[PDB]
Amino acid sequence: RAPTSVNAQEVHRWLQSFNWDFKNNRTKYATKYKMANETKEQFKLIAKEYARMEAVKDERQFGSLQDALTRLNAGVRVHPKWNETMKVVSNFLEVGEYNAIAATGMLWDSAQAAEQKNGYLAQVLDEIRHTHQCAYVNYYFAKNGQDPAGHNDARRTRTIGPLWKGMKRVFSDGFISGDAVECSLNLQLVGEACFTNPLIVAVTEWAAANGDEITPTVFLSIETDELRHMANGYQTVVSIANDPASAKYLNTDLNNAFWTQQKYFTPVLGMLFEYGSKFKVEPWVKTWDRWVYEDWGGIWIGRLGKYGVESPRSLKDAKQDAYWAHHDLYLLAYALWPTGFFRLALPDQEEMEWFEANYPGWYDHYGKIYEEWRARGCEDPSSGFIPLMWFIENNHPIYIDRVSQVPFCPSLAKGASTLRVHEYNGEMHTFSDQWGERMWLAEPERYECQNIFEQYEGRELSEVIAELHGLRSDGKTLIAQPHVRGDKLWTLDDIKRLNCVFKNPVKAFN
Amino acid sequence: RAPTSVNAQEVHRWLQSFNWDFKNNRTKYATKYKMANETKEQFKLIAKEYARMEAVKDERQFGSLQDALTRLNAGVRVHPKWNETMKVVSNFLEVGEYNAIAATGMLWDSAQAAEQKNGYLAQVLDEIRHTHQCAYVNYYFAKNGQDPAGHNDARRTRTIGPLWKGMKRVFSDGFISGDAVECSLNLQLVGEACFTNPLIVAVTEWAAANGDEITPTVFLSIETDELRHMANGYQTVVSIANDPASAKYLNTDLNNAFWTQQKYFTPVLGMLFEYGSKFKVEPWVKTWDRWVYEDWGGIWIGRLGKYGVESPRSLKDAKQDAYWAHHDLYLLAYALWPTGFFRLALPDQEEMEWFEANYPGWYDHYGKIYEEWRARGCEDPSSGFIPLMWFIENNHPIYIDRVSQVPFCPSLAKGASTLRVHEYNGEMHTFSDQWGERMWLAEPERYECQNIFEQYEGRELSEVIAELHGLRSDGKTLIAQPHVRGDKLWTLDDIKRLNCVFKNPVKAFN
Amino acid sequence: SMLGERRRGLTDPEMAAVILKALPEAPLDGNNKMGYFVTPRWKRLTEYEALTVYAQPNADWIAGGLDWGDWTQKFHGGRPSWGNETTELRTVDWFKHRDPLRRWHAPYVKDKAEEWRYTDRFLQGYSADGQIRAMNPTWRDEFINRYWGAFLFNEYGLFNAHSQGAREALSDVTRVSLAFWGFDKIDIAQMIQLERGFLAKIVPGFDESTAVPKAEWTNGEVYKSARLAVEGLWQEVFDWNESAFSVHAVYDALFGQFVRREFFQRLAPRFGDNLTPFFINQAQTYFQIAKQGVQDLYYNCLGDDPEFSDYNRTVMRNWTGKWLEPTIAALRDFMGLFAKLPAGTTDKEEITASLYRVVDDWIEDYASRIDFKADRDQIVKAVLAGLK
Amino acid sequence: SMLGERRRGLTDPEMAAVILKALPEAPLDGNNKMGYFVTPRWKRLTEYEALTVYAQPNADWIAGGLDWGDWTQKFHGGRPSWGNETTELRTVDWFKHRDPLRRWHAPYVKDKAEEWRYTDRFLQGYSADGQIRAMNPTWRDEFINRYWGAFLFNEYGLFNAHSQGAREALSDVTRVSLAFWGFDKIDIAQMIQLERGFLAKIVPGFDESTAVPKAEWTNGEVYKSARLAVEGLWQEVFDWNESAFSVHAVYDALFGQFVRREFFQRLAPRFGDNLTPFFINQAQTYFQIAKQGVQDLYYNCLGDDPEFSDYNRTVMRNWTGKWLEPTIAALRDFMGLFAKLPAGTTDKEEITASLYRVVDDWIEDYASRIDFKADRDQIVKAVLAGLK
Amino acid sequence: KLGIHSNDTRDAWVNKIAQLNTLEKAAEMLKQFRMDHTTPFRNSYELDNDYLWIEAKLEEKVAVLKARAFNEVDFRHKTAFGEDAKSVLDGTVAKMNAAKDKWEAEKIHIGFRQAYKPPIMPVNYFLDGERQLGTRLMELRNLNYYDTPLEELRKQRGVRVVHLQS
Ligand SMILES: OCCCCCCBr
Ligand SMILES: OCCCCCCBr
Ligand SMILES: OCCCCCCBr
Ligand SMILES: OCCCCCCBr
Ligand SMILES: OCCCCCCBr
Ligand SMILES: OCCCCCCBr
Ligand SMILES: OCCCCCCBr
Ligand SMILES: OCCCCCCBr
Ligand SMILES: [Ca+2]
Ligand SMILES: [Fe+3]
Ligand SMILES: [Fe+3]
Ligand SMILES: [Fe+3]
Ligand SMILES: [Fe+3]
């Protein structure tokens, strides 16, 4: 008659026996693989205990945010550039967290072992938590920050720009559309195992460096949930390792998933860090080589060799194209600044010195470009100039990869300069690399995404911005700006007066 | 079948009927008043809702502490002087919170109306909450701060010094020893209603100015519970306003309570703020006049007029003795620095300029004294000089008021210099004011507290320190210090070598 | 280590002054309300809505979507990441749904965590208080261990029916509600096992192995049709709304409520069992919480859709007829359990009255909301044929 | 303004630079453990002990005190703020006591808060689920509204018995335990009213007023001796240890445990009442919680005191006898309640089984501790002599 | 009117949709629309920017008409064209299992979608089809995925190479 109870592991011991056999007990999703009937999971959790462990983390997180951090005016004392970066960092990550909910529901359906299903289930619940956490960061900065615009409506204002298309490829569609296993490789084996450190942890470092203690509080909490997801990813490979289909398809799906994820991650994350900050933590080049190339591409992936997993065959190309990728892309992001939902800044003196020092040859290329745009009056509304005009004058067309959605200017890039144009059944397609090209050639019906030029063709710039609500509450000033200062902000009229009209660059081809 | 439930108010509606009439249904404590059994309370709470409202507060508080604040190294980045001040502020407040538990328990026993009992009950629990909160503050600074000594053992090391005695008089014994109503006046009508702002809120202000975000996080939470206690105090007067005994004893118990509380509060809190900090918020004289004299003595007390309450007759006397009170006392506290459990610091140049600016005449008296002591080497162990020696040399006796326990030096003070000395049944008694003198004369058996000179008589200083554990973990370096730097700390030997021996100053009149 | 090597912009003097110098005099926009553009269901926009609505990146071609254009990567064959083709129901806006309880992740895990800790306290109190002494042995070893135990598989099956919906839901608000309905079902299945594991600890000889309850579920007669219904609802339904609607607005509302409330919750007390009712209380609370969300989605939003009200009600009436038959079969087979009880436990009149309560509650809370013409006596008479 | 006018030392460049410059290279003492001088009851010092032990400023003349000298201000007449004179018990150290649950304020309100929120959820699900439909009217309107409700005054009286103890407790660990014991009692009483208020909301003519249940307590026959015992434990005892001991180790361990468990908790289920047991579950959990603390103090600390073991066991054995009788009378009068139950509700064979459960549990947890040789048969016989 | 979310093309089709008062006509229009405007095999890319939205509006009309015209059993088991849904599913899956290569397979899957996508075929049967057809398509396509050089793969797909840069 002593006080006793029952814990999670004591119930979990019998969870594997929960599922039973019947004719139609099988996954509803198409797949080339067979997840083993007896796959187990690493964490012996049940719903109740899962809730308690997350509830404790929430207390801490929200306690810090609502009390001390608010008392310290932490939402304000952040570098203007970092406030802008977080509009993108938090909202774009939010969609990855969101689609991961669906992804793990699809994986839960795929798994036949009760334990493997349960493992995926914990992630389904975690990704809902992360969605709400990323939302909360934007919610917090909008409520207490120096510029709520964008933070307060990214869910609809993100649709104006081209960079958002690429995000949906790797963090939305890439997570849920295709063989469930391919989706798992995109999400867990690559995305989470390879990016958690260089993305989530790294973001908390850059954040702290720029005065932001809000993001570290939330993201550090998110990070504590990831181990479970990496385990899910690892177990996915284990569950299919003993099926003959594995040796035939696993490395192909893994290679495609890796190229897909890095194609966007490499240029975009480096851009957000180096060009979206004042205080620099570490040069993106080394952060990339250490986490993506060495740690993941070497250590992590290596531990799965026993299961037939090989190093992505495209890892070499990724490294080669990496070096200048983020530098090349910011040129385009800034040139198209009116299409964003955030404010951009030209590198200052200390930054150019930092850039040249860490990336020799930077100044002679990008540095001089920015100096000219500056001279052309790109920061001043009365100038009537948008870098966009410079690309026209110097005949440097900007294309959109049909597969990855990543914008590229092959005539100007110091990095990859490949361009492939195809015509098929009355439609033109443009590719920036040999991997995405094969993807489209082999799977045309998977990649029919309309690009900004195709959708906006013949439209005057200010009209698109207005229709898609790219304005501040005064209904005139643009959310997006070419500088992060508090005065001389561009208005819709300043753009309309430039009479910029979209045209499809591929039409020039005969 | 609509979802239904019941709230606190819906139950509290019937709380008053909970108590039933019967033979010995009367308070067990001596009292001159009769609290009406029909007295109500302002907040309609029941145990469960009380718990919930406090649990939410705890969440935010501990969340900020464990997470964000720890990540910001908030326990460390505090001015050395303020780190020391909090050893005294939190632990001394701790005992007031603690004795308040017993006090309200006694008031709970006094009240006959179930609602009035319930109101006191909420405070019983609140004071337990506050006891643990103050404890946590010392606990946190001990665990994460620049100097754990004192923060880690104040509960025993506070017994070495004379300032602790006065604290127990106002926040321990004054809260529980005497007529329940006199205790209520000391605790709620005077203590809580008058000091909440100038003490708790002010502390958070001084703390923030000095880098301390730990104390604000906790003390601001404590503050949210005080309204209930002020209401309890207010209802205490209302509950006895009818009884004829009120017109004959209330204003007397109130005047004695006010003088009692201000006697310690005036000099000590001013001392902790102005001399226990680097950065200043506001001159203590201004704070005192605005809150004690104006707001409390005027607005608050005035509202109790309809119940026969009058401003303490000793209020004018208090304002007169207050001006130099804290300045006069720090000279004594510093001169006796070896008896504390915290490190003291002499005013720097900016501070002395600040004191002179806000207290014309400060430099010519205190300023010159401190410079004399410093030039003589009071901060250096090799000097062989402790300021108490300067008092002996210049024949400036330091007495302990038999009633308030507050140390005073008539021959040196710029403030009050009155001294009354009496002998009764073989015992000498020293008084510092007319109010405390009357208290002893009328109630001799209530005030027999032995002072440090009587207990330590004939004992060599280092001996008292050693026996009462006034040492750091190395078993040699004193907890107390005459400076706040990290080098040249005094040891038990640096003190023992001076052979300072305690003497009962009153025997000089023999 | 006291100060640290990492310099933080918020506290580092040099870095902080740079930050402050760059700051504007005041915010660059006074609209500090994230989600200000979302149409509030209630007086003012709620935290639940702001943090949830529009998280799903649907384009305008999926009712209510704010984005534009095709998905970036689709399935081999062309199937869209999310699309109208995954469900028969249509609406003017898939984002209209609102969980009446406004549950986003934080409040959801907070409440469940409170329940977990209180459950632990309760069990320690129950065991220490030796309350197990008064529980009828046969009820404990036969009905709780075998029959209540087999029911965990019913709840587990209903949990699994949600997998496809977690992937196909066409909006954030529906996905979150759907996920929480499913998570509560696995929680209940786990609480049934938890009770069995608790009994094994305080009752010598009590085997917590699921072998017995599972054999009853997979091969017994009492739960045969229930299992056939669960297998169908879970694996034969490929429409995420048909699944959620049929599970919660038909099968669980009739069969589930009868078993949990009219059998176990109703008879456990009679055998000195306050243990099972402790967990059934959670299951019923969960059922009532889900019901609010289920009613909002299928009746308030879809069944009453300004453009598709008639269409959606026709479809839901279709689904109700489709799943009502298998549900009646499940109840009919379950009637066999009454013949196993000790004589005098209950009678045909009590059984019948309890069936009518379940059927009548269902008519009021669900059937009537879509004009489904249910015949209470016809439903009950059909079930009663299962009595032995 | 956006930045505010107040400059904070942690973030203000100028002020922070000054603070940083003044900091020592490293902590001035490596002993960062507050309360390090406290003797741990377990393997390592707990947060509970560090934050509680020695908060009370007792001098060495009060067993365990670390301070010195007399109090600064005493009562008129000379009575000390706290003194050995307020209790018959003696010990080597009043700070020995330890709550096995290690409850300081935070954990205590966290747990009770969870219980409060779950309770509200439970009541909403209960009402929404229409579970009231199965409850027996007579039991509801007579036994719950009148007799259960009247029991609230018994718990309320026991709560009040703690008032003096809150003032006189000779240590912090004991004071905190005592306060929580009394607070849980008033909580129970309020939970009795809560239920009656809940019934008034879901049952047409149910009157929530305490009018009826109060007269039953103040004038009834079933609770006449119970009330007499309470009035004594509360207002006739001036020794805080006799009050706490007699209330929790005698009167409530017997009478209370019988009324709550062996009557309402045991009979409620039979009348289709899963509601009342929900609240009894709390009262019992609370009883078991307090029990571990009551045992540790009067047995582990005082009863087994290295120097006053014999003396205290004597005093307690003496108190057990002083109140074992008034407690017997309370039960006897309570027996008269069964004569009002629906003919056939229970037989004398059941009551005897329950009566012995209580008495036996009492001897195994309280009596045998201070060697109070008592006869189970005679107690049950004396109480059983109050039936029809 | 050339907007993103609202324009003349969309307005025009909304009117064209309002004139479908019978199931057979509406269902036929929807299937024709899919052959003309969806997938990379669409007859034309003229409606590339609005076809997704227009298709949805057309689906809405067919669904509403089908629900009113069909008895409960047929709504569950028959396509809008009156075919037994199960027979179509099984027959299509049979053809997929007999596909000799990935080229025949893609034609099968893509054609199935253009012709039977809900509200033509009931969702339950359609997604069960996605499950089976998608599996075989990927099995054939992902086998030795990189063996064929891009030079030759471009020829198999049948694209016209307009420009190459490297
Ligand atoms: O803060 C700078 C914004 C970062 C810009 C590039 C968009 Br992915
Ligand atoms: O966890 C949510 C899915 C995306 C994770 C990316 C790794 Br930083
Ligand atoms: O590869 C992931 C790309 C992330 C872009 C902004 C997110 Br932190
Ligand atoms: O509330 C605890 C007792 C002391 C209160 C003094 C007001 Br700062
Ligand atoms: O008036 C009482 C003064 C006590 C101050 C104790 C430090 Br917050
Ligand atoms: O921080 C300086 C400590 C203050 C000391 C005077 C004693 Br109350
Ligand atoms: O007033 C005289 C100061 C007392 C000397 C201190 C001796 Br330890
Ligand atoms: O540098 C000063 C030495 C530190 C004193 C040791 C205290 Br445990
Ligand atoms: Ca059968
Ligand atoms: Fe995540
Ligand atoms: Fe994840
Ligand atoms: Fe307090
Ligand atoms: Fe207080």
PDB file of N, CA, C and O in Angstrom, chain C residues 2 24 111 114-115 117-118 121 129 131 133 257 261 265 269 282 284 288 361, chain D residues 2 24 111 114-115 117-118 121 129 131 133 261 265 269 274 282 284 288 361:
ATOM      1  N   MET C   2      33.600  33.690 -15.734  1.00  0.00           N
ATOM      2  CA  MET C   2      32.649  34.628 -15.138  1.00  0.00           C
ATOM      3  C   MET C   2      31.992  35.561 -16.162  1.00  0.00           C
ATOM      4  O   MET C   2      30.772  35.652 -16.214  1.00  0.00           O
ATOM      5  N   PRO C  24      16.165  54.275 -35.367  1.00  0.00           N
ATOM      6  CA  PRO C  24      15.362  55.428 -35.776  1.00  0.00           C
ATOM      7  C   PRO C  24      14.782  56.051 -34.508  1.00  0.00           C
ATOM      8  O   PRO C  24      14.843  55.443 -33.435  1.00  0.00           O
ATOM      9  N   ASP C 111      -2.161  22.203 -20.838  1.00  0.00           N
ATOM     10  CA  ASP C 111      -3.270  21.475 -20.227  1.00  0.00           C
ATOM     11  C   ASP C 111      -2.991  19.974 -20.130  1.00  0.00           C
ATOM     12  O   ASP C 111      -3.289  19.344 -19.117  1.00  0.00           O
ATOM     13  N   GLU C 114      -0.634  19.317 -17.315  1.00  0.00           N
ATOM     14  CA  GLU C 114      -1.291  19.433 -16.008  1.00  0.00           C
ATOM     15  C   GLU C 114      -2.001  18.117 -15.703  1.00  0.00           C
ATOM     16  O   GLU C 114      -1.966  17.626 -14.581  1.00  0.00           O
ATOM     17  N   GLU C 115      -2.652  17.562 -16.722  1.00  0.00           N
ATOM     18  CA  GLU C 115      -3.382  16.308 -16.595  1.00  0.00           C
ATOM     19  C   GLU C 115      -2.459  15.136 -16.284  1.00  0.00           C
ATOM     20  O   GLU C 115      -2.820  14.250 -15.513  1.00  0.00           O
ATOM     21  N   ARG C 117       0.578  15.286 -14.737  1.00  0.00           N
ATOM     22  CA  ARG C 117       1.072  15.405 -13.370  1.00  0.00           C
ATOM     23  C   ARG C 117      -0.008  15.086 -12.339  1.00  0.00           C
ATOM     24  O   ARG C 117       0.259  14.414 -11.341  1.00  0.00           O
ATOM     25  N   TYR C 118      -1.231  15.550 -12.581  1.00  0.00           N
ATOM     26  CA  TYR C 118      -2.322  15.281 -11.660  1.00  0.00           C
ATOM     27  C   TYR C 118      -2.647  13.790 -11.664  1.00  0.00           C
ATOM     28  O   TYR C 118      -3.050  13.233 -10.641  1.00  0.00           O
ATOM     29  N   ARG C 121      -0.138  12.097  -9.448  1.00  0.00           N
ATOM     30  CA  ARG C 121      -0.468  12.368  -8.051  1.00  0.00           C
ATOM     31  C   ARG C 121      -1.638  11.483  -7.648  1.00  0.00           C
ATOM     32  O   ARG C 121      -1.626  10.854  -6.589  1.00  0.00           O
ATOM     33  N   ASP C 129      -3.537   5.090  -0.582  1.00  0.00           N
ATOM     34  CA  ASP C 129      -4.799   5.106   0.148  1.00  0.00           C
ATOM     35  C   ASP C 129      -5.459   3.725   0.122  1.00  0.00           C
ATOM     36  O   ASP C 129      -6.543   3.534   0.673  1.00  0.00           O
ATOM     37  N   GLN C 131      -7.195   2.151  -1.933  1.00  0.00           N
ATOM     38  CA  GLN C 131      -8.558   2.083  -2.454  1.00  0.00           C
ATOM     39  C   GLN C 131      -8.863   0.870  -3.338  1.00  0.00           C
ATOM     40  O   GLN C 131     -10.028   0.567  -3.591  1.00  0.00           O
ATOM     41  N   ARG C 133      -8.662  -2.121  -2.598  1.00  0.00           N
ATOM     42  CA  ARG C 133      -9.254  -3.179  -1.783  1.00  0.00           C
ATOM     43  C   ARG C 133     -10.739  -3.407  -2.055  1.00  0.00           C
ATOM     44  O   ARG C 133     -11.218  -4.540  -2.012  1.00  0.00           O
ATOM     45  N   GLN C 257     -19.024   6.810 -27.586  1.00  0.00           N
ATOM     46  CA  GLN C 257     -19.730   7.363 -26.447  1.00  0.00           C
ATOM     47  C   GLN C 257     -20.472   6.272 -25.681  1.00  0.00           C
ATOM     48  O   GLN C 257     -20.515   6.288 -24.452  1.00  0.00           O
ATOM     49  N   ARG C 261     -18.991   5.986 -21.969  1.00  0.00           N
ATOM     50  CA  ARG C 261     -19.941   6.547 -21.014  1.00  0.00           C
ATOM     51  C   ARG C 261     -21.092   5.666 -20.536  1.00  0.00           C
ATOM     52  O   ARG C 261     -21.396   5.650 -19.345  1.00  0.00           O
ATOM     53  N   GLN C 265     -18.088   3.754 -17.853  1.00  0.00           N
ATOM     54  CA  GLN C 265     -18.244   4.839 -16.891  1.00  0.00           C
ATOM     55  C   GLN C 265     -19.488   4.588 -16.032  1.00  0.00           C
ATOM     56  O   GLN C 265     -19.514   4.919 -14.846  1.00  0.00           O
ATOM     57  N   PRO C 269     -18.376   2.080 -11.458  1.00  0.00           N
ATOM     58  CA  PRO C 269     -18.691   2.468 -10.080  1.00  0.00           C
ATOM     59  C   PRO C 269     -19.397   1.357  -9.313  1.00  0.00           C
ATOM     60  O   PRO C 269     -19.125   1.132  -8.133  1.00  0.00           O
ATOM     61  N   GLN C 282     -11.109  11.853 -18.461  1.00  0.00           N
ATOM     62  CA  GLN C 282     -10.210  12.527 -19.389  1.00  0.00           C
ATOM     63  C   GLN C 282     -10.683  12.284 -20.816  1.00  0.00           C
ATOM     64  O   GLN C 282     -10.749  13.214 -21.628  1.00  0.00           O
ATOM     65  N   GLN C 284     -13.663  11.638 -21.905  1.00  0.00           N
ATOM     66  CA  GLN C 284     -14.906  12.354 -22.177  1.00  0.00           C
ATOM     67  C   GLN C 284     -14.652  13.853 -22.320  1.00  0.00           C
ATOM     68  O   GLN C 284     -15.271  14.514 -23.155  1.00  0.00           O
ATOM     69  N   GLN C 288     -15.467  15.955 -25.671  1.00  0.00           N
ATOM     70  CA  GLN C 288     -16.243  17.189 -25.690  1.00  0.00           C
ATOM     71  C   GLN C 288     -15.459  18.367 -26.264  1.00  0.00           C
ATOM     72  O   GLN C 288     -16.045  19.281 -26.862  1.00  0.00           O
ATOM     73  N   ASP C 361     -28.413  12.182 -28.187  1.00  0.00           N
ATOM     74  CA  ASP C 361     -27.371  13.207 -28.098  1.00  0.00           C
ATOM     75  C   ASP C 361     -26.762  13.407 -29.481  1.00  0.00           C
ATOM     76  O   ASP C 361     -26.421  14.529 -29.883  1.00  0.00           O
TER      77      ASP C 361
ATOM     78  N   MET D   2      10.615  55.432 -27.842  1.00  0.00           N
ATOM     79  CA  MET D   2      10.937  54.060 -28.226  1.00  0.00           C
ATOM     80  C   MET D   2      11.980  53.441 -27.290  1.00  0.00           C
ATOM     81  O   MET D   2      11.891  52.263 -26.947  1.00  0.00           O
ATOM     82  N   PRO D  24      35.637  42.025 -10.421  1.00  0.00           N
ATOM     83  CA  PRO D  24      36.864  41.291 -10.106  1.00  0.00           C
ATOM     84  C   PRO D  24      37.114  40.333 -11.265  1.00  0.00           C
ATOM     85  O   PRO D  24      36.208  40.079 -12.059  1.00  0.00           O
ATOM     86  N   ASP D 111       1.118  22.843  -8.304  1.00  0.00           N
ATOM     87  CA  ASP D 111       0.265  21.656  -8.216  1.00  0.00           C
ATOM     88  C   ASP D 111      -1.214  21.984  -8.019  1.00  0.00           C
ATOM     89  O   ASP D 111      -2.074  21.423  -8.708  1.00  0.00           O
ATOM     90  N   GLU D 114      -2.738  23.459 -11.154  1.00  0.00           N
ATOM     91  CA  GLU D 114      -3.040  22.435 -12.155  1.00  0.00           C
ATOM     92  C   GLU D 114      -4.373  21.775 -11.807  1.00  0.00           C
ATOM     93  O   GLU D 114      -5.222  21.549 -12.677  1.00  0.00           O
ATOM     94  N   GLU D 115      -4.550  21.469 -10.526  1.00  0.00           N
ATOM     95  CA  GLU D 115      -5.773  20.837 -10.054  1.00  0.00           C
ATOM     96  C   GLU D 115      -6.991  21.726 -10.300  1.00  0.00           C
ATOM     97  O   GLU D 115      -8.048  21.248 -10.695  1.00  0.00           O
ATOM     98  N   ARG D 117      -7.332  24.151 -12.669  1.00  0.00           N
ATOM     99  CA  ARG D 117      -7.632  24.227 -14.096  1.00  0.00           C
ATOM    100  C   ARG D 117      -8.227  22.925 -14.629  1.00  0.00           C
ATOM    101  O   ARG D 117      -9.164  22.948 -15.429  1.00  0.00           O
ATOM    102  N   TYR D 118      -7.697  21.790 -14.186  1.00  0.00           N
ATOM    103  CA  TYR D 118      -8.233  20.512 -14.635  1.00  0.00           C
ATOM    104  C   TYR D 118      -9.660  20.366 -14.117  1.00  0.00           C
ATOM    105  O   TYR D 118     -10.544  19.900 -14.837  1.00  0.00           O
ATOM    106  N   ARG D 121     -11.964  22.152 -16.302  1.00  0.00           N
ATOM    107  CA  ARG D 121     -12.118  21.433 -17.564  1.00  0.00           C
ATOM    108  C   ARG D 121     -13.039  20.237 -17.346  1.00  0.00           C
ATOM    109  O   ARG D 121     -13.925  19.956 -18.163  1.00  0.00           O
ATOM    110  N   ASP D 129     -21.189  16.591 -21.339  1.00  0.00           N
ATOM    111  CA  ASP D 129     -21.428  15.173 -21.591  1.00  0.00           C
ATOM    112  C   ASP D 129     -22.768  14.690 -21.016  1.00  0.00           C
ATOM    113  O   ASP D 129     -23.207  13.572 -21.300  1.00  0.00           O
ATOM    114  N   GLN D 131     -23.508  13.833 -17.995  1.00  0.00           N
ATOM    115  CA  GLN D 131     -23.340  12.715 -17.074  1.00  0.00           C
ATOM    116  C   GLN D 131     -24.206  12.793 -15.819  1.00  0.00           C
ATOM    117  O   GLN D 131     -24.325  11.813 -15.085  1.00  0.00           O
ATOM    118  N   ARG D 133     -27.294  12.922 -15.784  1.00  0.00           N
ATOM    119  CA  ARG D 133     -28.472  12.108 -16.074  1.00  0.00           C
ATOM    120  C   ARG D 133     -28.521  10.753 -15.372  1.00  0.00           C
ATOM    121  O   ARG D 133     -29.597  10.182 -15.194  1.00  0.00           O
ATOM    122  N   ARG D 261     -13.951   8.759   2.822  1.00  0.00           N
ATOM    123  CA  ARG D 261     -13.761   7.531   2.058  1.00  0.00           C
ATOM    124  C   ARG D 261     -14.806   6.440   2.279  1.00  0.00           C
ATOM    125  O   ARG D 261     -15.568   6.110   1.372  1.00  0.00           O
ATOM    126  N   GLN D 265     -17.197   8.362  -0.548  1.00  0.00           N
ATOM    127  CA  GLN D 265     -16.338   7.812  -1.594  1.00  0.00           C
ATOM    128  C   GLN D 265     -16.723   6.376  -1.948  1.00  0.00           C
ATOM    129  O   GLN D 265     -16.532   5.933  -3.084  1.00  0.00           O
ATOM    130  N   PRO D 269     -20.468   6.142  -5.851  1.00  0.00           N
ATOM    131  CA  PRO D 269     -20.461   5.405  -7.119  1.00  0.00           C
ATOM    132  C   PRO D 269     -21.738   4.599  -7.354  1.00  0.00           C
ATOM    133  O   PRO D 269     -22.242   4.531  -8.476  1.00  0.00           O
ATOM    134  N   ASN D 274     -20.150  10.118 -10.073  1.00  0.00           N
ATOM    135  CA  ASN D 274     -18.722  10.151 -10.365  1.00  0.00           C
ATOM    136  C   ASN D 274     -18.246  11.581 -10.120  1.00  0.00           C
ATOM    137  O   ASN D 274     -17.059  11.886 -10.240  1.00  0.00           O
ATOM    138  N   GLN D 282      -9.309  14.501  -4.524  1.00  0.00           N
ATOM    139  CA  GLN D 282      -8.392  15.572  -4.146  1.00  0.00           C
ATOM    140  C   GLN D 282      -8.168  15.555  -2.636  1.00  0.00           C
ATOM    141  O   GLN D 282      -7.029  15.569  -2.173  1.00  0.00           O
ATOM    142  N   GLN D 284      -8.404  13.210  -0.570  1.00  0.00           N
ATOM    143  CA  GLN D 284      -7.611  12.051  -0.191  1.00  0.00           C
ATOM    144  C   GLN D 284      -6.157  12.250  -0.584  1.00  0.00           C
ATOM    145  O   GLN D 284      -5.249  11.914   0.177  1.00  0.00           O
ATOM    146  N   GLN D 288      -3.143  12.256   2.100  1.00  0.00           N
ATOM    147  CA  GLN D 288      -1.929  11.458   1.989  1.00  0.00           C
ATOM    148  C   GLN D 288      -0.691  12.345   1.937  1.00  0.00           C
ATOM    149  O   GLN D 288       0.371  11.979   2.444  1.00  0.00           O
ATOM    150  N   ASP D 361      -5.736   0.996   9.479  1.00  0.00           N
ATOM    151  CA  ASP D 361      -4.820   1.880   8.767  1.00  0.00           C
ATOM    152  C   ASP D 361      -4.246   2.893   9.752  1.00  0.00           C
ATOM    153  O   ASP D 361      -3.075   3.263   9.667  1.00  0.00           O
TER     154      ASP D 361
END
